[PDB]
Design a protein around this ligand. Structure first.
Ligand SMILES: Cc1cc2nc3c(=O)[nH]c(=O)nc-3n(C[C@H](O)[C@H](O)[C@H](O)COP(=O)(O)OP(=O)(O)OC[C@H]3O[C@@H](n4cnc5c(N)ncnc54)[C@H](O)[C@@H]3O)c2cc1C
Ligand SMILES: Cc1cc2nc3c(=O)[nH]c(=O)nc-3n(C[C@H](O)[C@H](O)[C@H](O)COP(=O)(O)OP(=O)(O)OC[C@H]3O[C@@H](n4cnc5c(N)ncnc54)[C@H](O)[C@@H]3O)c2cc1C
Ligand SMILES: Cc1cc2nc3c(=O)[nH]c(=O)nc-3n(C[C@H](O)[C@H](O)[C@H](O)COP(=O)(O)OP(=O)(O)OC[C@H]3O[C@@H](n4cnc5c(N)ncnc54)[C@H](O)[C@@H]3O)c2cc1C
Ligand SMILES: Cc1cc2nc3c(=O)[nH]c(=O)nc-3n(C[C@H](O)[C@H](O)[C@H](O)COP(=O)(O)OP(=O)(O)OC[C@H]3O[C@@H](n4cnc5c(N)ncnc54)[C@H](O)[C@@H]3O)c2cc1C
Lengths: 364, 364, 364, 364
C-alpha cells in the first residue's frame, strides 16, 4: 500500500468500483479501500434491472441522467470482459410493467410519448408471456430496461481497474478523512495514505464521512428482502414489474424475485414476514411461481436520502473531496454515468450543468 | 464387505440404524446397506417430536406401542452417547397443543383422563408462554411429548452400532433380494451378500422390496416442507402444536417450524407456495415469529401407507424376511420400539401379540 | 405421466438430457425419467472441458467421434438459448497442455501435425500466461478444447426439450424394464409406462439395467474430487492442463480446479486427503493459486467401463433398447454426438459404422 | 434505543456478550452495540478449547487468571441455559498434548507437578486413543482443558443478558466515543446515547477507540484458518493438540481442525495454501483424518497486541471508560473472568491487584 495516490476511492460497491475503473482509465494513479469484499454489500442484493423508466415520473434531469447511463451500458459488457474475463451476464429480454387497475394504466400511459416504450393490451401481453397473471389490464413494454447481475458488473469493473493499474484494498475500512494540509489524509487500520482527491462511495454508510467533513447530509437505510426460485417449467423472457416489485428471469434458469421496503432497518438478513410478503406478491404476478423450488433468500440496504436522489458531486468548500452516494434503487443503472461524472469532475473536464446541479451536495 | 452376515438391514434412516444397533446389541453379526448417507433422507427432515399424544385418537395398540417407545427414550441419549460420543440433543420443555376453537377443545380434552396430560386455560398458557397467540381457547400440556434432533439420534445409533461390531455401508443401494436357496441373497452394485435374516427399512422406498417378495403393500409419499428461524428475542421453552403444525424450540436458539402435506409429491425440496403456507400458519401460533430471521428451508417424504400405520413384522410366508416401514409422522418416536421389536422377532423372543398383530404385513 | 410414449429415456444427466432434446427435435413423443434432479450427479461435478485432444494419442474412431462432437458444439449454445433462455456459459480461451519434462515434450509434440494445435516454448507460454509455473518446458496450445458449465448445458438441453414437447419426470426412479409384450414396459414408483424405444442413460448406475436385460456389462465408479477458488488478482484466459489435472477459469472469475482418481469409491463428497492432493497439484501448475480464496469443494463419480470407453448403441438382441453410458472423462464433450447418434439409431437413420462399432455393447 | 444507559458495551463478540451478562446480573441498566450480528466475527471461528494449560510455561499472573476463568466455567453452562435455553455444548473429554520429539517431552513434562495434569507414555496414549499418530513419544493429559462451542457460549450470554434487561442492538456500529460532558457520549448511525460507563470490547477492531481516546495501543490481526470433517468411523474423545494446532471432536460427530497463523492478514476467508497446511498438519496428528469427509472451512482474526496479552481495565485518565480486547488465543477461556473483572471494576468492587496490573492499558 503506497503512501500517496493521486486519487482515493472509499467504498468498493458497484459505485466505487465504477469510479476506480474510469479514474484508472484516465491513467490516474488511484487506490480503492473497501471495508469487506468488493461488492459484498447492497450491490450483491440488487436485482440488476437497468430501470431508467422506473423513475421517469417528471422528465427532469434525474431521468435524463438515468437514460444517459442506460445508454452507457451499450458495449460495456464487451469492454469490461476484454480486460477482466468477467461476464456481466446481461439479459436483453426487456420489461413488462404490469397494470392491475385503471390507476396503474393511467400511471403507465403517462410515458407513451417516449420511444421504445409501447403499451400492450391484456391479450398482447399474454401472447408474449402466457403465464403472467390474467388479472392484468395490460402492460407497458420497456425494451431497454434490461438486466445484468450486479455482483459481476462490480467484479468486472474492479478486475478491469486492476489491470489498468488501480490498487484495490479489501478488508481495509477507512476510519477518517483529514482535509488538513495541502493534500488529503485518510486513516485506515492498515496504514494511512495521502491523496490529491478523495471520493466517498460508501453507500448507505457514507453519512459518517459527510459529518466528518462538516456536512449534514443524512442517509436512511430502506431494507429490501428477496428470494430466488428455479424456473424449470415455463417460458419467461421478460421481466415482470409491478409496484416496485419484480420477477426477473436470469440466464441461469433462476428467477430473482422481490422486494420489501423496510425504512430504518439496518439488518441485512430477511425476516419471515418479509419473505412471506414477497412470495405472496410474486404469486399475483406470476401464478405458477408458487410451484417453483426455492433457491436462496437475502436482503440489502438501499441508500435512502432526504429527497430520494443521490449526491454526486464536489464538497461545497473543497473541490478535492467528491461524493457519490444515495442511489436508492437505481445504483446498478447509474454506475456508469456516476463513475464517468465523478471521473470528469476530478479530471476537471466540462460536464452537464443540469446533472451537476441536480445531484449537488448542498441541495435545499 | 463380507460374503455372509447373520442379519442384513436395508436402509440407513433412523429405523434401519435403530434396528442395526439392537441387533449388534444382541451380538448378532449384522450389516446395513444405505443408498446414500446415514439418515440423509426423511429422517433429516423430521422435527424430532416424541409425539405419542398426537396419535392417541382411539387408545388402541398403536397408541400403546407409541407410549412404550416414548418410555424407551428414557436414558437412551445417555446410553448411545457412551458408545458414540454423539449427543441426540434432547429438549424436555414439553408441549402445548393449542386450541383455537371449541372443536379443538373437544378434540384435546378427549385425553384429560391420561396422566402427564393436563388442560391449561388461555391465561395459564400465556403465563408460561406470553408470546403464544392470544386467540387461543387454551391448550393441552403434554409434558412427555419432548423432542430430539433426528439426524443425531440416527448418527448416534449408527456410531454405537459400529462400536458394537455392526458393519455399515453407505453409498451401497440394494438392488434385489432373492429368498431362493436356504439363505437370503441380496445384490448391490458393490457386490452380493448372503444372510440368514433380511430387514427392509427403506422408508417410503420400501415398496420395491415388498413387490419383489410377492407382496402388494404400497407406499405413498406425503411431502412436508419446513423452515427454521433464529429466535434471539423471546422466551420459548415449550413446543407449540396445532393441526399437525408446529414450532419447536431447539437448544441452539433456532425454531424448527412446520409442515405442509403434499400427497403423491416425491420431490424433496420446498416449493414457494408451501413455504409461504408454513410461514402464514406459524404466525397465527407465534405472532413474533414474523420478525425472526430465516435460517434454512427443507422438505422430506413421509412414508404413507393405506391405513396410516407402519408395517413392522415378518413376511407372511418367510420368517427370515422382516419389514419396518411406513412410520407416517411417528418415525423418530417409534425408532426404539420398532428397533427392539424387529430385534426380538429375529432373536425369536416373545413379543407383545397385540403390537405384532397391529403392525402385521398382511393387514386387511 | 401418460401411459404410453414413443421413446423413454432413463437418467437425466447431460447424456439423457441431450438424448431427449434430439428425440423431441425429431418430433418423437418422448419421456425422460430421472431419480433425482436433472444433471444432479456426475454431470454437475465435471469441469466442462471439451477435451477432444486428450484422446488423440491414437487417431482412431474414438478421436474422430470426439472431434465430431466438438464441432457439434459450434452454435449449440445459441440454438439451446433460443429455446431455453439458459446460457451454457462457453469460454473460448483455449487450452495449454503443460510439459514439466522432456518426456512430456516428446509426447505433446506428437500432435504438432494436428490443426488448431501448436507447440509453444517455455517463454512463449509465459508470454500469454505469465503466472503459469516457471518450471514448465513449454506447452501445446489447443485452441478448440474450450469449456462450458456442464450443469447449464444439461439444463439448457432439458428445458429446450420441454419446450419441444418432451415430458420430464424428476424424482421418478425407474425400477425395472420389461421386454415381453410387443412394446417395452417401464416400472416406476409413480406408475408403469409402455414405450416403443427405451434408452438407458443412467451413467455409472446403468449396470442394473444391463443385468436386468441379460447383459453383464460392468460399471465401476472412479471418484473425482475438485474445488474452486476466486481468482481476483491475476489474469488467466487459457485452461491449464497436465496429467489429467486442470485449472479452468470461468467467466465468473472462479477457477475450477482438480481431480483425484479413485476407482471403486461410490461416495460423492470429497475427503481431506483428496482435496489436499488437488491443492498440491494445482500449486505446481499455477503458483499464485496458493493465495486465492477457496470457494467450494465437491466430487463426482466417473462411470468406468472395462476399457474406459462408453457403450453407445442398441441391445444386441433387441433394437428397441439402447444404451448410452460409460463416458469416463468425456461425457460433456461427447454429449451432442452421443445424443444425435442415439436419436438417429431410433429414427433408424443411417449412421457411421465405425463409430457404431467402436461403442458396441457386446465388445468381446 | 433509549437516550441514556448506565453502561454501554461496544462489540458483541463473546467478550462483549459476557460483559453485558454480568452487568445485567448486577442490575445495571446496560446496552450493547454490535456492528453486525452477535458473535459473528472471531468468536465464531474459535475452536472453543478452555486452554488454561497453554499458558503455564510460566506460572505467573496470566496463568492464574486463566485457571480462574476455567473454574468460572464450572456450572456456567447450566446457569446460562436456565436463562437462555441455549446449550453451550460443553465436552469434557479432556486434552492430549502430544509430543513428537524428546524436546517436546522435556517441555511437556515441566507441568507434571500440576494437578489434573499427568504424563502418558506412547503406549498409554494409544491405549486411550488408538488412532493417534504412532509417531508420538507420548503426551501430557490435561483433564480440565475441555471445550465448548464459542458461538453458542456467546448466544447464551447475550440471550441471558436480554432476559435480565440488557438492551442489545445488532447492526449498530459505534462511530465515536465522546468524553467531554460529565457522562460519555456514544454516536451511532441509529442515533446518539449517553452513558456513565463505556466498555470497548470490539476485538481486533478496538484500536480506533483507543486512538479516539488518546491512547496508541495497537492491534494486529493474526488470521487463523480452519476446517471441519465428519468423523463417522473412529473413536476420538480427547482433543489432540500440538504446536498450537488441534483436532477437537464435537458432540455432533464433527472434528474441528486447525489453525494457521498469519499476522497482518485482515481477510476472513481461508485461502488454498492455508487450508492445505492445516490438512497436512492434521494428518501428522491423526492419520485416519485423511479419509474423512470435509464439512466446512473458515477463518478468523485473532486480536494481537504488542505482547500477545489482552488489555482489560480502565482508561488511565478516565475510570468511566474501560477496555477488554486483545485475547490472542484465549478469548473463549477468558470470557467469564474478563466479564466478571470488567463488571466488578464498574461496580467499583474490590479486585485482584495482580490481575489488574497484568492487563494494564498503559503497559510501558
Ligand atoms: C432488494 C434490492 C433490489 C435492488 N434492485 C436494483 C435494481 O434492479 N437496479 C438498480 O439499479 N439498483 C437496484 N438496487 C439498488 C442498488 O443495489 C444500490 O443503489 C447500489 O448497490 C448502491 O451501490 P453503492 O456502491 O453506492 O453501495 P454498496 O453496494 O452498498 O456498497 C458500499 C460499499 O462501501 C463499503 N464501505 C462502507 N463504509 C466504508 C468505510 N468506512 N471504508 C471503506 N468501505 C466502506 C461497504 O462495505 C460497501 O462495499 C436494489 C437494492 C435492493 C436493496
Ligand atoms: C416435515 C416432516 C416432519 C416430521 N416430524 C416428525 C416428528 O416430529 N416426530 C416423528 O416421530 N416423526 C416425524 N416425521 C416422520 C419421520 O421423519 C419418519 O417417519 C422417519 O424419518 C422414517 O424413517 P425411516 O428410517 O423409515 O425412513 P427414511 O428416513 O426416509 O430413510 C429410509 C432410508 O433407506 C434408504 N434406502 C431406500 N431405498 C434403498 C435401497 N434400495 N437400498 C438401500 N437403502 C435404500 C434411503 O436412502 C434412506 O436413508 C416427520 C416427517 C416429515 C416429512
Ligand atoms: C471431477 C470430474 C471432472 C470431469 N471433467 C470433465 C470434463 O472437463 N469434460 C468432459 O467431457 N467430461 C468430464 N467429466 C465426466 C463427465 O462428468 C461425465 O462423463 C458425464 O457427467 C456423465 O453423464 P451421464 O449423463 O452419463 O451421467 P450422470 O451425470 O452421472 O447422470 C446419470 C443420471 O441418471 C440418473 N439415474 C441413475 N439411476 C437411475 C434410475 N434407475 N432411474 C432414473 N434415473 C437414474 C442419475 O440420478 C443421474 O442424474 C468429469 C467427471 C468428474 C467426476
Ligand atoms: C482459528 C482460531 C481458533 C481459536 N481457538 C480458540 C480456542 O480454542 N480457545 C480460546 O479461548 N480462544 C480461541 N481463539 C481466540 C478467540 O476466538 C478470540 O480471543 C475471541 O473470539 C475474541 O473475542 P472478542 O469478543 O474480543 O472479539 P470478536 O469475536 O472478534 O468480536 C468483536 C466484536 O465487536 C464488533 N465490533 C467491531 N467494531 C465495532 C464497532 N465500531 N461498533 C460495534 N461493534 C464493533 C465486531 O463486529 C465483533 O462482533 C481462536 C481464534 C481463532 C482465529
Amino acid at each position: 500500500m503506497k503512501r500517496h495516490y493521486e486519487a482515493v476511492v472509499i467504498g468498493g460497491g458497484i459505485i466505487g468500483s465504477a469510479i476506480a475503473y474510469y479514474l484508472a482509465k484516465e491513467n490516474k494513479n488511484t487506490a480503492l479501500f473497501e471495508s469487506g469484499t468488493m461488492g459484498g454489500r447492497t450491490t450483491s442484493a440488487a436485482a440488476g434491472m437497468l430501470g431508467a423508466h422506473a423513475e421517469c415520473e417528471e422528465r427532469d434531469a434525474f431521468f435524463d441522467f438515468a437514460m444517459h447511463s442506460q445508454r452507457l451500458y451499450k458495449g460495456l459488457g464487451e469492454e469490461l470482459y476484454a480486460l477482466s474475463g468477467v461476464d456481466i451476464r446481461q439479459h436483453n429480454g426487456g420489461m413488462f410493467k404490469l397494470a392491475f387497475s385503471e390507476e396503474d394504466v393511467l400511471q403507465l400511459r403517462q410515458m407513451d410519448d417516449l420511444d421504445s416504450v409501447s403499451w400492450y393490451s391484456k391479450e398482447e401481453v399474454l401472447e408474449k408471456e402466457p403465464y403472467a397473471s390474467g388479472d392484468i389490464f395490460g402492460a407497458s413494454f420497456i425494451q431497454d430496461d434490461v438486466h445484468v447481475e450486479p455482483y459481476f458488473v462490480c467484479k468486472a469493473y474492479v478486475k478491469a481497474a486492476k489491470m489498468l493499474g488501480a490498487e484495490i484494498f479489501e478488508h481495509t475500512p477507512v476510519l477518517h478523512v483529514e482535509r488538513d494540509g495541502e493534500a488529503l489524509f485518510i486513516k485506515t487500520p492498515s496504514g494511512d495514505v495521502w491523496a490529491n482527491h478523495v471520493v466517498v462511495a460508501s453507500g448507505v454508510w457514507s453519512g459518517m464521512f459527510f459529518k466528518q467533513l462538516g456536512l449534514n447530509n443524512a442517509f436512511l437505510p430502506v431494507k429490501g428482502e428477496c428470494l430466488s426460485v428455479w424456473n424449470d417449467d415455463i417460458p419467461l423472457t421478460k421481466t415482470l414489474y409491478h409496484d416496485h416489485c419484480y420477477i426477473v428471469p436470469r440466464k441461469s434458469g433462476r428467477l430473482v424475485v422481490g422486494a420489501t421496503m423496510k425504512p430504518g432497518d439496518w439488518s441485512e438478513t430477511p425476516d419471515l414476514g418479509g419473505l412471506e410478503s414477497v412470495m405472496k406478491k410474486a404469486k399475483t404476478m406470476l401464478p405458477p411461481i408458487q410451484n417453483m423450488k426455492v433457491d436462496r433468500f437475502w436482503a440489502g440496504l438501499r441508500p435512502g436520502t432526504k429527497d430520494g436522489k443521490p449526491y454526486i458531486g464536489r464538497h461545497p468548500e473543497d473541490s478535492r473531496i467528491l461524493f457519490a452516494a444515495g442511489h436508492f434503487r437505481n445504483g446498478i443503472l447509474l454506475a456508469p454515468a456516476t463513475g464517468a461524472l465523478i471521473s470528469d469532475l476530478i479530471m476537471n473536464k466540462e460536464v452537464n450543468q443540469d446533472w451537476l446541479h441536480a445531484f449537488r451536495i448542498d441541495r435545499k
